[PDB]
Amino acid sequence: AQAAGAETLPAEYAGGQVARGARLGMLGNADVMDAPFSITSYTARTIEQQQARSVADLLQANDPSVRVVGGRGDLVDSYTIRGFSVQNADVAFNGLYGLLPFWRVPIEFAERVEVLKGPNALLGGISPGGSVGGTINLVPKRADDQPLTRVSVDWTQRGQLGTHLDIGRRFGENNAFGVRFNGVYRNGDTAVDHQSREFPMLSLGLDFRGERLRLSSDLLYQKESLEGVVRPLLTGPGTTHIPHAPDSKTRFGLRDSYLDQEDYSMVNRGEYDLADNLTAFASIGGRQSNYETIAANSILVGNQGDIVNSLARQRGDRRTYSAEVGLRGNFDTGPLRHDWTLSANRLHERLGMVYAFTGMQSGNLYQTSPHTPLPDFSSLDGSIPKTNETDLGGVALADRLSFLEDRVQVTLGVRRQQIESRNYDQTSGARTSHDKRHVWTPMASVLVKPLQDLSLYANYIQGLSQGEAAPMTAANAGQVLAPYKAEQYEIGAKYDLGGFTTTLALFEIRKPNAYTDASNVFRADGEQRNRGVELSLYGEPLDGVRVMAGATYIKPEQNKTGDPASEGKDAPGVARRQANLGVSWDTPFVDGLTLDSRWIYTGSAYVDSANALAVPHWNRVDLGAAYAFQVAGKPLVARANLENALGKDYWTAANGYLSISSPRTLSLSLTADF
Ligand SMILES: O=C(O)c1csc(-c2ccccc2O)n1
Ligand SMILES: O=C(O)c1csc(-c2ccccc2O)n1
Ligand SMILES: [Fe+3]
Ligand SMILES: [K+]
Ligand SMILES: [K+]
Ligand SMILES: [K+]
Ligand SMILES: [K+]
Ligand SMILES: [K+]
Ligand SMILES: [K+]
């Protein structure tokens, strides 16, 4: 069947650090040179080589277009992509939303971590968090035919001890069935003052390989428990400048904070080839997410480095269902080949989320905080009441027209997207809001291959975000606005020299934003207009020398505000320049030895809409090494990764707050295949 390849895992590219292709949502997997989008897919090889544990670890080290807000000391990572914030809750799982750990995705069970840059509502529907900067997609591990019995042990500053089992088996006639299990247990003191972390994780990738039938089921369990929670530093009404970043080992937030975050999910997927030119597919999954924390956000007071920590307890019970069904077919109209996809999806979520802010405790950026009182938060004990219900569902039809022996490709699609949410007050249980909307959202793209190894492309595509509720201060307080429609135009070029590829892209993304005006009326009358250029090179351009290099330049314009002080200024939290350079070098002179280095750069950015508060540019250097050897006939690999090797301390800017950098962090690991 022609559509039977939609879920086929893309081959690794030269060097094995990235893959040749990635998911285009409802369209399934596309080769990089057939994709009229900027897509990058990082491999398990890279994940294991750099000892990346989370999406954030991997993406900020390697990708010129992804920067992380929060960080591994915090309970939550978020990602900025093409000048827009992308929630970790909007990370996709084989294209499906709502099924991965809500605050921080671990990737030690991942075969691929893909980045599709820019919005993609036509391809995937709306994301639960409304993100539009890009879609990160995780592809889970599957069992290969040759059995895998892999064990590794690892140490990470200051005392985190870990073990990782990666076991794969196939069985049944013709290895029709596969089982891949990943188990991680990592526990101990982190690199940050007075912080410890416990991390159990279990995953099973199950699949069935049949003549006209393909099935899979993914089960995931994970918990992250932190003693000590790093949190944002907020700007105050009279902040005049951003103080110099403290030592990243210092922890200036709530000393006796804690996080207990548990997620588990199951997702079953299938395809069935009804004919040579018709394939049915369906997915159904669910996720439970349990959230418990007491922590404090730091607020600048004065400008000498004093802070006040604002304490809170938060509790969450989130229950998500996420499903898709559809058909993929193909036919011809003369010289046109049609490859069409009809897809429908549905996400349904029930959330209980209670919180109480109590306590304001003085501190200082440059002092690890002392033990301070924890307020009585017992009124949140017991059952967590329902506070929100979300229902997203859509139907999409897309057609890829192939002309002139597939050297010209035109893709058209439209999706009808339904959005519905209901909110209930955490104390009274009163129904505070019921938002219900539908929107149509289209795409158009064209790709031309003048050379076999040169692809030129353009796309138009939209992003969708649920409208915001007006703050309980404005004239229309509580009213939640119409959905925000972001719009992207992109053009680019991709050139595949065989062992390495160079890409270029120019994009614009326009998105409405909401502010309270002079009439204290909350309206969606603002607009952000991000215009950017992206360049990258990746591959193995010399034998035994792999290179991933990229840079981006963006003008992130607040091109419509209700304010002259901010009109035309830069969106906060969006550096105009970012670049990454990674080199991995198989030394010709030591057998089995590989040396890695990375340089991450982020230019100056602002925290405020008026741009009166700039944060400096920053640089991070990583050093790595891998040593492959044999003992008793079995392969072993010893690894070392030194993140932030120079021990630089820096702020990452966001809109209204800053996240402190993670300190210099060595991890060491030994892996054996039995
Ligand atoms: O209710 C909350 O969780 C809440 C209110 S402001 C806030 C906040 C504001 C800036 C940065 C991080 C934050 O967590 N958080
Ligand atoms: O989105 C947010 O505002 C958010 C996410 S965790 C969080 C938080 C967690 C512990 C204490 C205070 C907080 O504000 N806040
Ligand atoms: Fe918060
Ligand atoms: K991390
Ligand atoms: K996690
Ligand atoms: K999306
Ligand atoms: K390991
Ligand atoms: K942080
Ligand atoms: K760092």
Automatic annotation (TrEMBL):
Gene: femA
Localization (cell): Cell outer membrane
Family: Belongs to the TonB-dependent receptor family.
Name the UniProt record assigns to this protein: Ferric-mycobactin receptor, FemA
Motif (TonB C-terminal box): 657-674
Organism this protein belongs to: Pseudomonas aeruginosa (strain ATCC 15692 / DSM 22644 / CIP 104116 / JCM 14847 / LMG 12228 / 1C / PRS 101 / PAO1)
Segments forming a coiled coil: none
Keywords recorded for this protein, A-Z: Cell outer membrane, Ion transport, Iron, Iron transport, Membrane, Receptor, Signal, TonB box, Transmembrane, Transmembrane beta strand, Transport
One Gene Ontology cellular component annotation held by this UniProt entry: cytosol
Main location per the UniProt record: membrane
GO terms, molecular function: siderophore uptake transmembrane transporter activity; sigma factor activity; signaling receptor activity
GO biological process: regulation of iron ion transport; siderophore transport; siderophore-iron import into cell
Membrane topology listed for this record: Multi-pass membrane protein
